[PDB]
Amino acid sequence: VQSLTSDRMIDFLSNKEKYECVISIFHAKVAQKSYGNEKRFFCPPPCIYLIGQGWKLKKDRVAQLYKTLKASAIHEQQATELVAYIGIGSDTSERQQLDFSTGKVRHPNIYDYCAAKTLYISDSDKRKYFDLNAQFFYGCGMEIGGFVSQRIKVISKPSKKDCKYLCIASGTKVALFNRLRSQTVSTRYLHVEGNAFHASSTKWGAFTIHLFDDEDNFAVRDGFVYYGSVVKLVDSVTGIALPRLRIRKVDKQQVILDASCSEEPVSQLHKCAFQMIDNELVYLCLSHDKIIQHQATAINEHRHQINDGAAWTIISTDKAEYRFFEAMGQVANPISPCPVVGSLEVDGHGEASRVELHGRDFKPNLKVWFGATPVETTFRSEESLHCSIPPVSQVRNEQTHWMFTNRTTGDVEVPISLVRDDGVVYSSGLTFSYKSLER
Amino acid sequence: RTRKRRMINASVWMPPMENEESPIKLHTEAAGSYAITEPITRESVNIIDPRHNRTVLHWIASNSSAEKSEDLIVHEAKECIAAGADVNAMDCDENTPLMLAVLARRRRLVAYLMKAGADPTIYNKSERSALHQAAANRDFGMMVYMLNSTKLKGDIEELDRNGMTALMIVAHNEGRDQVASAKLLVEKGAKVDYDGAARKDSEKYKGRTALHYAAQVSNMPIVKYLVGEKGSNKDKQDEDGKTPIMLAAQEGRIEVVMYLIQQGASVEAVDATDHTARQLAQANNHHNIVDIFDRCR
Amino acid sequence: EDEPTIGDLNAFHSGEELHRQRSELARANYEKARPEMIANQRAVTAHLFNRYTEDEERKRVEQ
DNA sequence: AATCTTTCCCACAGT
DNA sequence: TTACTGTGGGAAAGA
C-alpha cells in the first residue's frame, strides 16, 4: 500500500514540471484500406509525443532500481530503454515498433517523439472502424501502460463528389498536408513551432478548424465547413492561429470556384486552399518548408491557377493526452486504464453541494482531490464521479496559502485530481474555485 | 446569442510574401447573513459589479447567506428587484440570478424572480438551461413549477455542455421523484427517444438517448418506465454504435442486462469496433454477465 | 404564489444514498477481478518484451 | 435510375 | 538496367 499523503501531494502539485509525465498521441480520424498485398500507409501518420521532464526522472526511478535490485553474483544501458509498439485493430498484423531508442539521431519541452508510418489496414480486416493500441514499457521488462485512441473510420477511397466522419465539422480538428507525384519523401504538414507557423517534414499539427461567424476574439458558429466559407485555423496546442481564410476547392492544381460549390461540404482527404479574405487572389501556401502568402495567376472567372505547394489535403485528426505521475516510486502494476477528465460540473447549495466530473476510463479505484484535500468520491459510470465540496477551511494552510490562493481575484481555486488508491496522480487540469469576498 | 455560436479568443500570426480598494459594503452585507442596510436604489443594485461580476440579487440569490436569514432573502430580493434590477444579469460563470436560485433551490425566490420578468432559459457557462439544473440536483417541484412558461418548454430538448437534455440528466440520477420528474417532461412536451439530432450538426455532442443513461449503471425504475411506458428501442446505437444493453453490459449491471434481454433487446448487433455486449462484459471481466448471455441462447 | 423555501431534501438524500450504494458495491466488483485484470495485462504487456529482446537479439547476433 | 462506393488495374518514380 | 514497392489516377463491379 503506497497511498498518498497530503504532504507528498504538495511536493507534486508544487513542482508538476519537475515531476509529471505527459504522453500525447496524435492520429488521423480516417484511414484508407489497402487492397490485396499493397500497403497504403496511414497519412498523416499516428505519432506519439513524450512530454515533460518527468520522463527523465521516470528513468532514474528505475535506473536506480535495476542496479539497486541487482545485488548479487553493459546490459545496463538496455534496462532503461523505452520500448513501445503501436498497433491497429490488429488481428493479423504483428503490431509495429516505434523507435524511442537511446541510439537515435535527431535530424521545446518535448522529451522524445516517434511516428508510426508503416501502419496500414488490409481488406482482410472487415471492420468498419478500429482504434489504435499503444504499449509502453522499459527495456528492463518494466511496464508503463497500454492505451487506445478514439475510433478511426475505414474508407475505400476518398469520395470525389453518417456524415461527421465524412464532412469536417465546425469545431473539429484537422491537419493540412502537401504531397508530390506518386511519392512520399516530400510530405510536409502544417505545424507550429515556437510561436509561429511553417511546414514540417518530421511532424504534423492538429488544428481546430472554426467556422467564422461575424462581428483577436471572434465569432465561431456550428456547422460543417462548406467550400467558400470563412474558416479560422487555430493550433490545438499553443493557441496561436492563422488569419481569416476562405477554404476553397481545387482539382488538378486548379482552384475550382463557381457558385455551385457553396453547396458542397469539404470532404475528407480532398485538396483545397485558403484564399485571403481581402485579396481573393492570394492563397495560403508554403514555398519550401516555410509558409507564406502568394499571388497565384488568374485564369477564368469560375477557376484559378495556383502554385504547386499551395493546395493541400485536409483531414480530420484527433488526439489524446495522458498526464500521470507516480506519487510514491513506480507501482507494481501498470497504469493502462488511464482516466481522462472532460468537464467539471456542480449543483446544489452549500450543504447540498456536489461536483460532477465527466470523462472516459473512470475506475472506481480513484479518489478525487481538491488540491491537497481528498473527498468521499462516488463512482457511478466509468464516465462520471460525484463528490462533495470540502469545507474551505480545510484546504489551504500557512504553507499551501500561496498556490491555492488565486493571486488575481484573491479567491481560492485548487487543482482537481483523480487519484489511484496506489499513490498515483492523474491531473485533470481543471480547477475548483471558491468565491471569496476579502481584501 | 444561442448555443450554436460561441466566442473564441486566440493569438495570431501573419505570413510574409517574399525575401529581400472597493469591497462593496452593500454586497458583503447582502452576502453576509442578516444586516440589511445601505441604499437599495437603481444606483444601488443594477449598476454595481465586483470581480465576479455579480449583482446584488446574484449575492442575494446565493442562499449561502448561511448563519440562517430565512425569509428575508425572498424579501431582501423583492426589494432590489422592485427598486429596479436586471433580473437577468449574468455573473462570472454566466449565471443568471434565477439560476443561482435553482442551484440553492429557493423555489419561492425563484417564483418571484421569474414573475419579475426573469428568464430561466438563459443557460450558463455550462451551456445548461435552468431545467437542466433542476434535473441536475433532481428537485422535482422546482422544475414542475418552471414548466409553465411557454418559452421554457421550447428549450425542452436543448442539451447542456455534455450534450444532455432534461430526461437525459434525469435518467442519469436515481430516486423516487425521478420516474415522475420524467412522466412530467414527456407530458410537458419532450420526445422520449431523442438522440441529439438537432445537433448531429457540428458541436460534437451526441450519441445516446435517455434509456442509455439509465441503462448505464442502473436506474431500473426508469429503464422500466422507458421500455415499459412506450417507445425507446432497446436496439438503438450511439455514436459508438452501442445498444443500452451493451453500455449496461460494459459497466456491469446484471440487473438491467436481464430486463432488457427479457424484453427482446437485440444482443446480435455490434458496436463500432465490431464488439458486442458479451465481448464487452467479457472484456472488462464481468463473468456474472458473460455467463448470463451463454445461459440464454 | 408564495410556496416553499427548501424542496424535498430527502429525495436528494435518499438518492445520494442509492448512489453511494452502488459505488461501494461496484468498488467491490472491480476489487474482485482486479488481479485477473492486471493478469491479462501483466502477460500481454510482456509478451511484447520477450518479443522485443529476440527481435533485439538480432542486433546482437549480426555484428 | 442515377449515382456513389468499392474493388481492381496499372503507370510513375523511387529503392 | 531489372525487380520491387508506395501512391495516385482511373476503369470496372457493386450498392
PDB file of C-alpha atoms in Angstrom, chain A residues 143-350:
ATOM      1  CA  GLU A 143       5.795  -1.909 -17.508  1.00  0.00           C
ATOM      2  CA  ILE A 144       4.310   1.551 -18.101  1.00  0.00           C
ATOM      3  CA  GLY A 145       0.850   1.236 -19.572  1.00  0.00           C
ATOM      4  CA  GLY A 146      -1.421   0.488 -22.505  1.00  0.00           C
ATOM      5  CA  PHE A 147      -3.567   2.990 -24.368  1.00  0.00           C
ATOM      6  CA  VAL A 148      -6.076   3.167 -27.196  1.00  0.00           C
ATOM      7  CA  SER A 149      -7.125   6.091 -29.353  1.00  0.00           C
ATOM      8  CA  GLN A 150     -10.515   7.283 -30.449  1.00  0.00           C
ATOM      9  CA  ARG A 151     -12.218   5.295 -33.206  1.00  0.00           C
ATOM     10  CA  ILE A 152     -10.945   5.603 -36.784  1.00  0.00           C
ATOM     11  CA  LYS A 153     -13.099   5.042 -39.849  1.00  0.00           C
ATOM     12  CA  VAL A 154     -12.086   2.866 -42.715  1.00  0.00           C
ATOM     13  CA  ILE A 155     -12.581   4.205 -46.208  1.00  0.00           C
ATOM     14  CA  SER A 156     -12.145   2.545 -49.611  1.00  0.00           C
ATOM     15  CA  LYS A 157     -11.008   5.705 -51.323  1.00  0.00           C
ATOM     16  CA  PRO A 158     -11.760   9.394 -50.735  1.00  0.00           C
ATOM     17  CA  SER A 159     -15.074  10.283 -52.453  1.00  0.00           C
ATOM     18  CA  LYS A 160     -14.676  12.736 -55.345  1.00  0.00           C
ATOM     19  CA  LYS A 161     -18.117  14.417 -55.465  1.00  0.00           C
ATOM     20  CA  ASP A 162     -23.114   9.074 -41.118  1.00  0.00           C
ATOM     21  CA  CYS A 163     -21.647  12.461 -42.029  1.00  0.00           C
ATOM     22  CA  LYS A 164     -19.450  13.660 -39.169  1.00  0.00           C
ATOM     23  CA  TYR A 165     -16.788  11.211 -40.391  1.00  0.00           C
ATOM     24  CA  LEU A 166     -17.137  12.252 -43.990  1.00  0.00           C
ATOM     25  CA  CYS A 167     -17.577  16.013 -43.586  1.00  0.00           C
ATOM     26  CA  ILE A 168     -15.466  18.320 -41.486  1.00  0.00           C
ATOM     27  CA  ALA A 169     -17.349  19.742 -38.505  1.00  0.00           C
ATOM     28  CA  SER A 170     -17.314  23.369 -37.447  1.00  0.00           C
ATOM     29  CA  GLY A 171     -15.435  22.757 -34.229  1.00  0.00           C
ATOM     30  CA  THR A 172     -13.289  19.734 -35.084  1.00  0.00           C
ATOM     31  CA  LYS A 173      -9.528  19.189 -35.522  1.00  0.00           C
ATOM     32  CA  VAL A 174      -7.619  18.571 -38.728  1.00  0.00           C
ATOM     33  CA  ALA A 175      -4.193  18.544 -40.310  1.00  0.00           C
ATOM     34  CA  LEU A 176      -3.275  20.028 -43.662  1.00  0.00           C
ATOM     35  CA  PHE A 177      -0.615  18.249 -45.694  1.00  0.00           C
ATOM     36  CA  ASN A 178       1.111  18.514 -49.055  1.00  0.00           C
ATOM     37  CA  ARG A 179       2.460  15.767 -51.272  1.00  0.00           C
ATOM     38  CA  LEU A 180       4.138  15.326 -54.630  1.00  0.00           C
ATOM     39  CA  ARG A 181       3.599  12.888 -57.512  1.00  0.00           C
ATOM     40  CA  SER A 182       3.303   9.199 -56.522  1.00  0.00           C
ATOM     41  CA  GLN A 183       5.951   9.581 -53.767  1.00  0.00           C
ATOM     42  CA  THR A 184       6.385  10.070 -50.005  1.00  0.00           C
ATOM     43  CA  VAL A 185       9.787  11.605 -49.038  1.00  0.00           C
ATOM     44  CA  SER A 186       8.384  15.063 -49.811  1.00  0.00           C
ATOM     45  CA  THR A 187       5.485  15.100 -47.374  1.00  0.00           C
ATOM     46  CA  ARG A 188       5.011  18.361 -45.482  1.00  0.00           C
ATOM     47  CA  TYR A 189       2.416  19.084 -42.772  1.00  0.00           C
ATOM     48  CA  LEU A 190       1.155  22.427 -41.456  1.00  0.00           C
ATOM     49  CA  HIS A 191       2.629  22.706 -37.975  1.00  0.00           C
ATOM     50  CA  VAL A 192       3.560  25.393 -35.448  1.00  0.00           C
ATOM     51  CA  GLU A 193       6.934  25.591 -33.726  1.00  0.00           C
ATOM     52  CA  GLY A 194       7.953  28.302 -31.294  1.00  0.00           C
ATOM     53  CA  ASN A 195       5.059  30.724 -31.659  1.00  0.00           C
ATOM     54  CA  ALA A 196       4.959  30.608 -35.469  1.00  0.00           C
ATOM     55  CA  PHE A 197       3.696  28.551 -38.401  1.00  0.00           C
ATOM     56  CA  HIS A 198       5.741  26.694 -41.032  1.00  0.00           C
ATOM     57  CA  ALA A 199       5.704  23.210 -42.595  1.00  0.00           C
ATOM     58  CA  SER A 200       7.356  20.163 -41.046  1.00  0.00           C
ATOM     59  CA  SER A 201       8.676  17.070 -42.715  1.00  0.00           C
ATOM     60  CA  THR A 202       9.156  15.451 -39.345  1.00  0.00           C
ATOM     61  CA  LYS A 203       5.774  16.014 -37.655  1.00  0.00           C
ATOM     62  CA  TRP A 204       2.233  17.379 -38.207  1.00  0.00           C
ATOM     63  CA  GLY A 205      -0.048  19.585 -36.119  1.00  0.00           C
ATOM     64  CA  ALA A 206      -3.696  19.297 -35.108  1.00  0.00           C
ATOM     65  CA  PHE A 207      -5.633  22.451 -35.890  1.00  0.00           C
ATOM     66  CA  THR A 208      -9.151  23.166 -34.652  1.00  0.00           C
ATOM     67  CA  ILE A 209     -10.872  24.490 -37.776  1.00  0.00           C
ATOM     68  CA  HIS A 210     -13.518  27.077 -36.813  1.00  0.00           C
ATOM     69  CA  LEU A 211     -16.404  28.312 -38.892  1.00  0.00           C
ATOM     70  CA  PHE A 212     -16.178  32.108 -38.663  1.00  0.00           C
ATOM     71  CA  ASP A 213     -19.492  33.748 -37.821  1.00  0.00           C
ATOM     72  CA  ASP A 214     -19.393  37.563 -37.611  1.00  0.00           C
ATOM     73  CA  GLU A 215     -18.541  40.799 -35.693  1.00  0.00           C
ATOM     74  CA  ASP A 216      -8.145  38.520 -31.525  1.00  0.00           C
ATOM     75  CA  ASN A 217     -11.522  37.372 -30.197  1.00  0.00           C
ATOM     76  CA  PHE A 218     -14.152  36.403 -32.765  1.00  0.00           C
ATOM     77  CA  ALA A 219     -17.421  34.751 -33.669  1.00  0.00           C
ATOM     78  CA  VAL A 220     -17.493  30.988 -34.364  1.00  0.00           C
ATOM     79  CA  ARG A 221     -20.628  29.053 -35.329  1.00  0.00           C
ATOM     80  CA  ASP A 222     -21.687  25.440 -35.636  1.00  0.00           C
ATOM     81  CA  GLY A 223     -21.901  23.744 -38.991  1.00  0.00           C
ATOM     82  CA  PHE A 224     -19.989  21.570 -41.457  1.00  0.00           C
ATOM     83  CA  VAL A 225     -17.295  23.547 -43.179  1.00  0.00           C
ATOM     84  CA  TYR A 226     -18.588  24.247 -46.714  1.00  0.00           C
ATOM     85  CA  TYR A 227     -16.350  25.406 -49.615  1.00  0.00           C
ATOM     86  CA  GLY A 228     -16.189  29.171 -49.757  1.00  0.00           C
ATOM     87  CA  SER A 229     -16.830  29.699 -46.041  1.00  0.00           C
ATOM     88  CA  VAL A 230     -14.611  31.862 -43.833  1.00  0.00           C
ATOM     89  CA  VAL A 231     -12.507  29.457 -41.850  1.00  0.00           C
ATOM     90  CA  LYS A 232     -10.308  30.181 -38.840  1.00  0.00           C
ATOM     91  CA  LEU A 233      -7.467  27.652 -38.250  1.00  0.00           C
ATOM     92  CA  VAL A 234      -6.292  27.521 -34.654  1.00  0.00           C
ATOM     93  CA  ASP A 235      -3.471  25.274 -33.407  1.00  0.00           C
ATOM     94  CA  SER A 236      -4.717  22.971 -30.617  1.00  0.00           C
ATOM     95  CA  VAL A 237      -1.567  23.062 -28.510  1.00  0.00           C
ATOM     96  CA  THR A 238      -0.028  26.540 -28.476  1.00  0.00           C
ATOM     97  CA  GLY A 239      -3.198  28.530 -29.048  1.00  0.00           C
ATOM     98  CA  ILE A 240      -1.805  30.557 -31.951  1.00  0.00           C
ATOM     99  CA  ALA A 241      -3.917  30.984 -35.118  1.00  0.00           C
ATOM    100  CA  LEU A 242      -3.866  31.977 -38.752  1.00  0.00           C
ATOM    101  CA  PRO A 243      -5.696  34.958 -40.275  1.00  0.00           C
ATOM    102  CA  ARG A 244      -9.224  34.666 -41.587  1.00  0.00           C
ATOM    103  CA  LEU A 245      -9.258  32.391 -44.660  1.00  0.00           C
ATOM    104  CA  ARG A 246     -11.792  31.181 -47.184  1.00  0.00           C
ATOM    105  CA  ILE A 247     -11.316  27.453 -47.718  1.00  0.00           C
ATOM    106  CA  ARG A 248     -11.722  26.626 -51.407  1.00  0.00           C
ATOM    107  CA  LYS A 249     -11.840  23.565 -53.668  1.00  0.00           C
ATOM    108  CA  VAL A 250      -9.093  22.547 -56.117  1.00  0.00           C
ATOM    109  CA  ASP A 251      -8.851  19.941 -58.881  1.00  0.00           C
ATOM    110  CA  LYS A 252      -5.569  19.130 -60.600  1.00  0.00           C
ATOM    111  CA  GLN A 253      -3.668  22.209 -59.394  1.00  0.00           C
ATOM    112  CA  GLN A 254      -6.752  24.301 -60.230  1.00  0.00           C
ATOM    113  CA  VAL A 255      -8.810  26.239 -57.659  1.00  0.00           C
ATOM    114  CA  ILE A 256     -12.340  25.232 -58.795  1.00  0.00           C
ATOM    115  CA  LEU A 257     -14.634  28.008 -57.529  1.00  0.00           C
ATOM    116  CA  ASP A 258     -18.083  28.551 -59.066  1.00  0.00           C
ATOM    117  CA  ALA A 259     -21.345  29.217 -57.193  1.00  0.00           C
ATOM    118  CA  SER A 260     -22.410  25.564 -57.127  1.00  0.00           C
ATOM    119  CA  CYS A 261     -19.576  24.862 -54.671  1.00  0.00           C
ATOM    120  CA  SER A 262     -21.088  26.562 -51.616  1.00  0.00           C
ATOM    121  CA  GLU A 263     -23.470  23.600 -51.722  1.00  0.00           C
ATOM    122  CA  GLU A 264     -20.516  21.250 -51.296  1.00  0.00           C
ATOM    123  CA  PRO A 265     -19.235  20.298 -47.845  1.00  0.00           C
ATOM    124  CA  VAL A 266     -15.461  19.815 -47.583  1.00  0.00           C
ATOM    125  CA  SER A 267     -14.938  16.037 -47.827  1.00  0.00           C
ATOM    126  CA  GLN A 268     -12.044  14.093 -46.207  1.00  0.00           C
ATOM    127  CA  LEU A 269      -8.637  13.870 -47.847  1.00  0.00           C
ATOM    128  CA  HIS A 270      -9.660  16.282 -50.564  1.00  0.00           C
ATOM    129  CA  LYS A 271      -7.336  19.060 -51.651  1.00  0.00           C
ATOM    130  CA  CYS A 272      -8.048  22.722 -51.201  1.00  0.00           C
ATOM    131  CA  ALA A 273      -6.503  26.079 -50.420  1.00  0.00           C
ATOM    132  CA  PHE A 274      -7.332  29.079 -48.275  1.00  0.00           C
ATOM    133  CA  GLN A 275      -7.629  32.380 -50.113  1.00  0.00           C
ATOM    134  CA  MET A 276      -7.204  35.512 -48.048  1.00  0.00           C
ATOM    135  CA  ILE A 277     -10.308  37.489 -47.202  1.00  0.00           C
ATOM    136  CA  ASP A 278      -9.238  40.777 -48.848  1.00  0.00           C
ATOM    137  CA  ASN A 279      -7.020  39.887 -51.835  1.00  0.00           C
ATOM    138  CA  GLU A 280      -9.124  36.999 -53.222  1.00  0.00           C
ATOM    139  CA  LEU A 281      -6.208  36.042 -55.469  1.00  0.00           C
ATOM    140  CA  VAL A 282      -3.853  35.155 -52.618  1.00  0.00           C
ATOM    141  CA  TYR A 283      -3.749  31.631 -51.209  1.00  0.00           C
ATOM    142  CA  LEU A 284      -2.133  30.189 -48.087  1.00  0.00           C
ATOM    143  CA  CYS A 285       0.960  28.440 -49.326  1.00  0.00           C
ATOM    144  CA  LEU A 286       4.351  27.093 -48.391  1.00  0.00           C
ATOM    145  CA  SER A 287       7.352  27.579 -50.650  1.00  0.00           C
ATOM    146  CA  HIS A 288       9.807  25.090 -49.203  1.00  0.00           C
ATOM    147  CA  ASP A 289       9.431  24.181 -45.515  1.00  0.00           C
ATOM    148  CA  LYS A 290       8.123  27.645 -44.528  1.00  0.00           C
ATOM    149  CA  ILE A 291       4.670  29.149 -45.083  1.00  0.00           C
ATOM    150  CA  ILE A 292       3.815  32.443 -46.771  1.00  0.00           C
ATOM    151  CA  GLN A 293       1.094  34.224 -48.764  1.00  0.00           C
ATOM    152  CA  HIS A 294       1.060  34.146 -52.575  1.00  0.00           C
ATOM    153  CA  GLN A 295      -0.488  35.822 -55.586  1.00  0.00           C
ATOM    154  CA  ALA A 296      -1.346  32.955 -57.915  1.00  0.00           C
ATOM    155  CA  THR A 297      -2.347  33.510 -61.554  1.00  0.00           C
ATOM    156  CA  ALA A 298      -5.911  34.240 -62.714  1.00  0.00           C
ATOM    157  CA  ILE A 299      -7.395  32.137 -65.498  1.00  0.00           C
ATOM    158  CA  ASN A 300     -11.174  32.499 -65.915  1.00  0.00           C
ATOM    159  CA  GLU A 301     -13.915  33.757 -63.603  1.00  0.00           C
ATOM    160  CA  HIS A 302     -15.003  30.355 -62.324  1.00  0.00           C
ATOM    161  CA  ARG A 303     -11.479  28.998 -61.708  1.00  0.00           C
ATOM    162  CA  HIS A 304      -7.914  29.970 -60.707  1.00  0.00           C
ATOM    163  CA  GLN A 305      -4.383  28.648 -61.234  1.00  0.00           C
ATOM    164  CA  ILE A 306      -2.283  28.215 -58.094  1.00  0.00           C
ATOM    165  CA  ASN A 307       1.242  27.186 -57.214  1.00  0.00           C
ATOM    166  CA  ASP A 308       2.051  23.504 -56.681  1.00  0.00           C
ATOM    167  CA  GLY A 309       2.604  23.675 -52.926  1.00  0.00           C
ATOM    168  CA  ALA A 310      -0.435  25.923 -52.470  1.00  0.00           C
ATOM    169  CA  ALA A 311      -3.148  23.260 -52.482  1.00  0.00           C
ATOM    170  CA  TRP A 312      -3.272  20.628 -49.730  1.00  0.00           C
ATOM    171  CA  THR A 313      -5.252  17.656 -48.479  1.00  0.00           C
ATOM    172  CA  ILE A 314      -7.327  18.377 -45.377  1.00  0.00           C
ATOM    173  CA  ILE A 315      -8.232  15.549 -42.989  1.00  0.00           C
ATOM    174  CA  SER A 316      -9.876  15.428 -39.579  1.00  0.00           C
ATOM    175  CA  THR A 317      -7.390  14.407 -36.979  1.00  0.00           C
ATOM    176  CA  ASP A 318      -7.869  13.842 -33.256  1.00  0.00           C
ATOM    177  CA  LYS A 319      -5.559  13.301 -30.337  1.00  0.00           C
ATOM    178  CA  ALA A 320      -5.366  12.108 -26.767  1.00  0.00           C
ATOM    179  CA  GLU A 321      -3.114  13.293 -23.973  1.00  0.00           C
ATOM    180  CA  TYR A 322      -2.235  11.336 -20.885  1.00  0.00           C
ATOM    181  CA  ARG A 323      -0.955  13.025 -17.763  1.00  0.00           C
ATOM    182  CA  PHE A 324       0.267  10.928 -14.855  1.00  0.00           C
ATOM    183  CA  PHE A 325       2.825  10.863 -12.047  1.00  0.00           C
ATOM    184  CA  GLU A 326       3.992   8.236  -9.557  1.00  0.00           C
ATOM    185  CA  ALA A 327       3.260   9.723  -6.140  1.00  0.00           C
ATOM    186  CA  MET A 328       5.434   7.076  -4.422  1.00  0.00           C
ATOM    187  CA  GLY A 329       8.005   5.289  -6.603  1.00  0.00           C
ATOM    188  CA  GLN A 330       6.888   3.243  -9.579  1.00  0.00           C
ATOM    189  CA  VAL A 331       3.948   0.998  -8.732  1.00  0.00           C
ATOM    190  CA  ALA A 332       3.936  -2.791  -9.130  1.00  0.00           C
ATOM    191  CA  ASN A 333       1.115  -2.735 -11.658  1.00  0.00           C
ATOM    192  CA  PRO A 334       0.944  -0.538 -14.749  1.00  0.00           C
ATOM    193  CA  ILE A 335      -1.300   2.453 -15.408  1.00  0.00           C
ATOM    194  CA  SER A 336      -3.175   1.294 -18.535  1.00  0.00           C
ATOM    195  CA  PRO A 337      -6.693   2.291 -17.537  1.00  0.00           C
ATOM    196  CA  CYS A 338      -5.817   5.991 -17.518  1.00  0.00           C
ATOM    197  CA  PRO A 339      -8.693   8.408 -16.651  1.00  0.00           C
ATOM    198  CA  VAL A 340      -9.421  11.395 -18.835  1.00  0.00           C
ATOM    199  CA  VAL A 341     -11.468  14.160 -17.227  1.00  0.00           C
ATOM    200  CA  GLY A 342     -13.679  16.055 -19.633  1.00  0.00           C
ATOM    201  CA  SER A 343     -15.759  18.661 -17.874  1.00  0.00           C
ATOM    202  CA  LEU A 344     -16.468  19.516 -14.232  1.00  0.00           C
ATOM    203  CA  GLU A 345     -19.996  20.452 -13.096  1.00  0.00           C
ATOM    204  CA  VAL A 346     -21.570  21.493  -9.776  1.00  0.00           C
ATOM    205  CA  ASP A 347     -25.109  21.601  -8.445  1.00  0.00           C
ATOM    206  CA  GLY A 348     -26.923  22.260  -5.188  1.00  0.00           C
ATOM    207  CA  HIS A 349     -26.224  24.654  -2.327  1.00  0.00           C
ATOM    208  CA  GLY A 350     -23.515  24.659   0.364  1.00  0.00           C
TER     209      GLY A 350
END
